[PDB]
Design an enzyme around this catalytic site. Structure first.
Site, PDB file in Angstrom:
ATOM      1  N   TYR A 167       0.876  -1.324  -0.151  1.00  0.00           N
ATOM      2  CA  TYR A 167      -0.161  -0.107   0.075  1.00  0.00           C
ATOM      3  C   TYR A 167       0.924   1.382   0.580  1.00  0.00           C
ATOM      4  CZ  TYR A 167      -3.742   4.009   1.647  1.00  0.00           C
ATOM      5  OH  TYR A 167      -4.114   5.020   1.556  1.00  0.00           O
ATOM      6  N   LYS A 212      -1.321  -1.179  -3.765  1.00  0.00           N
ATOM      7  CA  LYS A 212      -2.748  -0.304  -3.854  1.00  0.00           C
ATOM      8  C   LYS A 212      -1.436   1.061  -4.519  1.00  0.00           C
ATOM      9  CE  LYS A 212      -6.099   3.108  -1.376  1.00  0.00           C
ATOM     10  NZ  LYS A 212      -6.581   3.126   0.208  1.00  0.00           N
TER      11      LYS A 212
END
Lengths: 292, 292, 292, 292
Positions: free
Chosen positions: D135, D163
């Site tokens: 992330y 992400k």
């Protein structure tokens, strides 16, 4: 000639059309020498609006400043540029006029490698035969040089030291420890006291054009260890500087000159040429509070 | 004349002493028109090593480029400078030569306010009477302009739009939404595809000097919605661009021109003037892999 | 209790599995009190690896440190967090244990507005009844607070002042000028001299865990105006600090404690838990050169 | 279970004292599944106010969201933390609950080295046995990972991909080129169309809680090469997003939920808990213009 001490970064007087005002430039020179009592002048720097001017205008300023100052003070000539050929031409011209050292901003706009930067300094030194002061202004340039890289630059024995304009006092202390015989001039008037506490050799600044009496006191008191008194004067100094910054740096120092009878003229486009009326009135209050 | 589409940011051939090599510059211009099939040239940009040159050398390049291209393609002249007087001079000269538009980098080095920036564009436009393309390169300049500020600039009807060099695709969308009739040219060759997907009207780039065939494919495919094919071609393009960046941007492009018989010459000091031999071998590999 | 002077930011001794080693933590406390001769401890700061710990471990550390220190020195508890409810719970716990002040880093990760930041401080103060020191570390947090904003915070009479960790000596001077009765503690050990020269009331630092003798000398000599001697001691200090930084900050201070018989233990994952062998050898060299 | 496509980063309903409102959380879950028609939810992310909560509250949210969603959609659990032990605890809990993948923000606050970051991901994976989505949020973290470093992370076969929340579309293209079988989710709702044009596999976003219908249209139309229609819908989308950002991101999305009868509750302190009445009126306008 001794290059330690207090140097005003010389402001230049322009006419409304942007040409040099020779008479006003000579007044500014005179005022720094006789009233501000500076050790020297730093000519063709950021403060002189240098980077907005033609090669011819820069030569004109070097000539006039030298002519008016003669041999009463030290003079350093900033000749740096993204154009190395212009820098060499300016360097030779200032050298011929008798400037005590050159200085040159690290080349900017493009992202130059360190060995390009070193080669730029070496080329100016070689072509001129003059001393060089490395000009470090990371907040304008985005350029950050380390202690080891300074050592590589200092391999050239004509490189005297650095005009330090970053607020990194860790680096400042590291440079003094590593190269005790190389000089450092502080570039930030509002941080003069902490810089002098670390043993800088001098200061080069825009505000000394109008506040040179306080700047010398801060510097000399600090070096004598009179901190309590240096601090008070730094406080009043920074009240003045804070106002000058909020009002417009170059225009407001010029307005403070004009209020002392110096014909400091306009600023050069694309900088705003003259203060709005309210900012004139604001400069008058600064004059009344701090410079009367 | 239509200013949409594919524009090579024109490289300039220098001799070993840094003088312009006219014969080489003409070969570079001829190769972009006849082999790269560009819509136009953007002359006097970062790519042409503009900011390392004298005013006379800049004028010389404008003249030569225009003389060689004639009226076969569109030409844009980048005439921006920290010196507004120089910008006006170059703007008038390029206009008299018949360049289809001017362009000007936002003034740099000094921290200019936005009304200073607007006044700078307005002054160039008024003095020249020509069209103006606002030139936005925040990674070199440190200057960031917003949607509202672009709106203020666009109150001048001769401002056609912007060469966008920030990688802020939110801003890029917001600008197209707010000013749908103003033009945007993408400035980052390696992000052509996402930029075209947002409706930019063209691209201005250094790599189109040798990769102009693929650049036009990516751009026209993306606008037709052939993303699968556009992406494949962007992938190979960016293998080439990654290699070029790693080996030295300007010198490697010039090496790639030389390999096709264009006398692209040296780069200009204080940039490194020529590739080391292993870097020449590296450029040959890029040539064999991507441009044979 | 007087909160001026020299505060070590307390390191914590962890076991191999990351649990707190209570015997070791006690040794580190005792060493700071008896051998480093500090005025106080700042507990639960960055140096304590606080942000890598659960709320229970933080509570455990506050209690052990208080229990060992008793009333021999001043203690400050850093209770700040992105979680305000955790900060309140910790603030009440530390207040009940008798800490002389709280302190709290500005809330981070999210971009909080200034009124949210002020409300955070006001909430912690209201829930605990204790004093508060604003903890300013912009190089870790990305959060920058101005003189006026400090003034809004200082409207709460329980806010004592600020742990200053930015290298902005202009702001530091301006804060001392504006709020002469509010306290400033310097956060950068390697810039202690310039900070003391501007009148800071104290310092909070990670290196005082092993270099607390020299730290006190620099601070007290600077305040007495003995700059020449303070500078020499700052030079040697910064030789030590440069080596500690290159070798790995927290691990190397722990290794330097170990070399004096203190079981300062491991660091806490996701920090690297222990030095490689060569880095152990390097820390031994630092101990030989600077701390023997 | 397929993890491509459209994921709302799930908002959490809080009471006036900051406790979780279970009934409200369930309404938000239900609204995303039934009305926004999302492919999945991303639970315990920045949007869920995660980093302001205790471990127990995070667990409570994972349990409620999974209970309410059951197996109708894909669920991703964000379990990252500066505390690796809390990360492992949350990762094990979410895995036991049956979340289809974990995700973890790069550790923040301290400046971790890359091998430390890799060891963090590897530890979480080893302790849980679950899939991991890396992330990447550089604008909140200050953490920047390159293509080679992503390759080192991807040596762990349980790491599915990333992400992506930086706006660096060059890096995005380079990552797809180098690791074609690893997945990318776009993190920036207002840059959906250019991200989808580069072949991202999905999007995780806060605004999909109220603008899920448009988000899916932009994404699917782009992948089908209907750029003209995708761009129109991105334009309207970004008018809504601009309003939401100006008015206060999380509070305005919740207000938009409340206007559709979802009890989205307050925000959690130290974020501002509730909108002022003019900001409520402003949100109603966004609702009238874009979501009626």
């Amino acid at each position: 000639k001794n290059l330690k001490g207090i140097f005003s970064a010389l402001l230049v007087s322009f006419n409304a059309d942007g040409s040099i005002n020779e008479k006003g430039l000579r007044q500014i020179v005179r005022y720094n020498i006789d009233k501000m009592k500076v050790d020297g002048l730093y000519v063709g720097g950021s403060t002189g609006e240098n980077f907005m001017l033609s090669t011819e205008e820069k030569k004109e300023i070097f000539r006039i400043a030298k002519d008016e100052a003669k041999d009463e003070i030290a003079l350093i000539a900033q000749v740096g540029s993204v154009n190395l050929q212009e820098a060499i031409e300016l360097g030779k011209y200032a050298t011929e006029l008798g400037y005590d050292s050159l200085s040159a901003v690290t080349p900017f706009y493009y992202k130059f490698s360190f060995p390009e930067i070193k080669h730029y300094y070496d080329s100016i030194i070689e072509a001129t035969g003059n001393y060089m002061i490395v000009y470090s202004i990371p907040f304008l340039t985005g350029v950050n040089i380390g202690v080891e890289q300074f050592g590589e630059l200092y391999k050239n024995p004509k490189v005297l030291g650095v005009k330090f304009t970053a607020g990194d006092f860790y680096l400042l202390e590291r440079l003094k420890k590593a190269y005790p015989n190389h000089l450092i001039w502080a570039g930030f008037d509002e941080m003069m006291l902490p810089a002098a506490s670390l043993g800088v050799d001098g200061a080069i600044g825009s505000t000394f054009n109008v506040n040179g009496v306080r700047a010398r006191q801060i510097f000399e008191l600090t070096q004598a260890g009179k901190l309590k008194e240096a601090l008070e004067i730094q406080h009043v100094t920074n009240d003045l500087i804070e106002g000058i910054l909020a009002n417009g740096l170059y225009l407001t120092i010029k307005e403070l000159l004009k209020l002392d009878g110096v014909e400091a003229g306009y600023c050069r486009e694309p900088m705003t040429k003259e203060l709005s009326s309210e900012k004139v009135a604001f400069a008058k209050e600064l004059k009344a509070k701090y410079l009367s």
